[PDB]
């Protein structure tokens, strides 16, 4: 299906497609590789590939081949990684990739309402892009924001504990050139309860408190 796991050459995605790293990306790559032992430099594949994705927005075959060439790895060892991990985009995506969580901790809290409100506001379907090439909607699994549900992820930022009105606001803002404030759209700032702090409303004790003697 949409995730085919095969690659048939096209004019947009071929080995001759024009990818290359920037002189800054090369130094970041040098550092990354330095974060691993000297004999094991084929472990930088994931960070270098996500880096290329950041530079180019998505991942064409030439990108993987260049990553391999840089790290001196077989390109199939990179195709496998790219296909296995989902954060890696092998088709061009929109300016703002929207990943909606629809697992039960969020579903329970009316996530399909958000999925629909996005289906309508944007004029797309559950896995399509926009003609403007700005939005891209997909369904995904738990994003570690199960308590501030519902929630969605838009290009490395979370927007949590939201509602149709809030997502409508976010979309009206992204279509005006703004980047909203990541975080819950309700009163709470984080996983803290909504009613009020019920666990730690005291001040913290501070250094040397509770320390056992003989240490």
């Amino acid at each position: 299906g949409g995730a085919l796991f095969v690659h048939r050459d096209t004019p947009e995605n071929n080995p001759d497609t024009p990818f290359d790293f920037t002189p800054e990306n090369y130094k970041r790559i040098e550092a990354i590789v330095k974060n691993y032992p000297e004999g094991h430099q084929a472990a930088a594949v994931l960070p270098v590939l996500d880096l290329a994705q950041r530079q180019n927005g998505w991942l064409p075959i030439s990108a993987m081949n260049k990553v391999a060439e840089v790290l001196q790895v077989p390109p199939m060892r990179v195709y496998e990684v790219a296909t296995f991990y989902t954060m890696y985009n092998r088709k061009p995506v929109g300016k703002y990739h929207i990943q909606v969580c629809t697992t039960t901790p969020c579903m329970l809290r009316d996530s399909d309402s958000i999925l629909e409100t996005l289906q309508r506001k944007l004029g797309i379907k559950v896995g399509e892009t926009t003609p403007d090439k700005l939005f891209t909607l997909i369904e995904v699994e738990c994003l570690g924001a199960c308590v501030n549900a519902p929630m969605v992820q838009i290009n490395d930022n979370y927007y949590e504990d939201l509602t149709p009105k809030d997502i409508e606001e976010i979309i009206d803002e992204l279509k005006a050139g703004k980047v909203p404030k990541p975080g819950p759209r309700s009163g709470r700032f984080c996983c803290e309860p909504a009613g009020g702090l019920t666990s730690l409303t005291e001040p913290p004790k501070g250094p040397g408190f509770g320390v056992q003697a003989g240490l």
Binding site: V81, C142, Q212
Partner: protein, 429 residues
């Protein structure tokens, strides 16, 4: 001895859990972090393991393994190979955000724990494999690591100890199976997040083919506070074999969902009503609960009352604690639909290198969609049970157990719902 419910802030171990104080080094020192770590280090490693043991601290990753013994499988002489410590921060288990909260609001505790456990095991660095969706959290973590390297708490002379230690962060590219000790390591090594078998054991041959000990964020973040205040203090909380202050995450069909620290072996009903605002409609409207994460069997209202939220009680309740992510359902739920979505999640997040999960999880997802519709016959429920049991103990990893268990719970407590769906489908024809 009894009534392990309440816990004072004097004894809470993750003080900036709600982002109320500065998460940088100023708040860490002002709250009790990076204090006396020099003496902790100049103390022997065997002493740190003695503390981890006399504290009863059991891992929070999802399996109840005692650390001290785990971290003591690694206190051997070196064979000319660098020893490592890999922190597990890839919390993809539905309902779990505690590690996110830690990472982003009190990371210096995690760093100090890396250092302490490293001196305990003989490590040379700490690889913090963090989820890839947590970019801001990883950035805060790297900021903290830079602050620590500048202050001299990690690096060449970590706090002035003659012990040299590095801390590396590593992003994951979004996979739930990379949360296993072994697939974590493969990812770090560059290969797919395909787990490896045991034996070998990470302590013998692990990351980069070297000795390794994987550990959860919470475990390591707690280790220095234990070594500093005392394991006996940590062991006064909770029951005998299971002890400590455990983070909790209460999600779904609850009015005030939240994250909290409490005494283990706490009554679940209290844990909900006191900290959260109770289920939306009232305890009477509670259909069922998942005590731990999605990898834990359901339990219905009947036993949810007198149940203690720890390992052993939940085992005796035909379920498990896991990561302590209480998912609550009320009577307005197609529970079959929730469990089917869980099975679909496990279907997507399977790696695919061992036959049982690969095939049977998609099998069970199809069967579960059918049960949702009701197109099935009630003679297929036992077939599904047998399939689950064929998957359970025949896999390389636990994700097969995690995909098989919620089905067993559903069928062990909500069979009549399935049969009634089948009856309605037969009438509709």
């Amino acid at each position: 001895k009894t009534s392990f419910g309440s816990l004072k802030d004097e004894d809470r171990i993750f003080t900036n859990l709600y982002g109320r104080h500065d998460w940088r080094l100023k708040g860490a020192l002002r709250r009790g972090d990076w204090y006396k770590t020099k003496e902790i280090l100049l103390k022997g490693p065997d002493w740190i393991l003695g503390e981890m043991k006399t504290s009863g601290l059991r891992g929070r990753g999802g399996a109840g393994f005692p650390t001290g013994l785990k971290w003591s499988f690694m206190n051997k002489p070196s064979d000319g190979r660098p020893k490592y410590l890999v922190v597990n921060a890839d919390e993809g288990e539905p309902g779990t955000c505690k590690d996110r909260e830690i990472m982003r609001h009190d990371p210096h505790k995690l760093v100090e724990g890396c250092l302490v456990g490293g001196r305990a095991m003989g490590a040379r660095a700490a690889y913090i494999y963090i989820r890839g969706e947590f970019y801001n959290e990883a950035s805060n973590l790297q900021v903290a690591i830079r602050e620590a390297y500048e202050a001299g708490l990690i690096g060449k002379n970590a706090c002035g100890s003659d012990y040299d230690f590095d801390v590396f962060v590593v992003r994951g590219a979004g996979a739930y199976i990379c949360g296993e000790e072994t697939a974590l390591i493969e990812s770090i090594e560059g290969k797919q997040g395909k787990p490896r078998l045991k034996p070998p054991f990470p302590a013998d041959v692990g990351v980069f083919g070297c000795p390794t000990t994987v550990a959860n964020v919470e475990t390591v973040a707690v280790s220095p506070t234990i070594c500093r205040r005392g394991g006996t203090w940590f062991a006064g909380f909770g029951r005998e074999r299971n002890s400590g202050t455990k983070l909790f995450n209460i999600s779904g069909h609850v009015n005030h969902p939240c994250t909290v620290e409490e005494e283990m072996s706490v009554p679940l009903k209290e844990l909900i009503e006191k900290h959260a605002g109770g289920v939306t409609g009232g305890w009477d409207n509670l259909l069922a609960v998942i005590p731990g994460g999605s990898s834990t069997p359901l339990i219905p209202k009947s036993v949810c009352e007198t149940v203690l939220m720890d390992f052993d009680a939940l085992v005796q309740a035909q379920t498990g604690l896991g990561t302590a992510a209480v998912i609550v359902m009320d009577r307005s739920t197609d529970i079959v639909k929730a469990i089917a979505r869980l099975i679909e999640f496990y279907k997507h997040e399977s790696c695919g290198q061992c036959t049982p999960c690969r095939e049977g999880v998609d099998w069970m997802n199809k069967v579960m969609a059918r049960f949702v519709k009701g197109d099935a016959r009630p003679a297929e429920i036992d077939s599904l049970w047998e399939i689950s049991k064929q998957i359970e103990g025949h896999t390389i990893c636990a994700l097969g157990d995690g995909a098989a268990w919620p089905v067993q719970g559903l069928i062990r407590h909500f069979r009549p719902e399935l049969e009634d769906r089948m009856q309605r489908f037969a009438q509709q024809h």
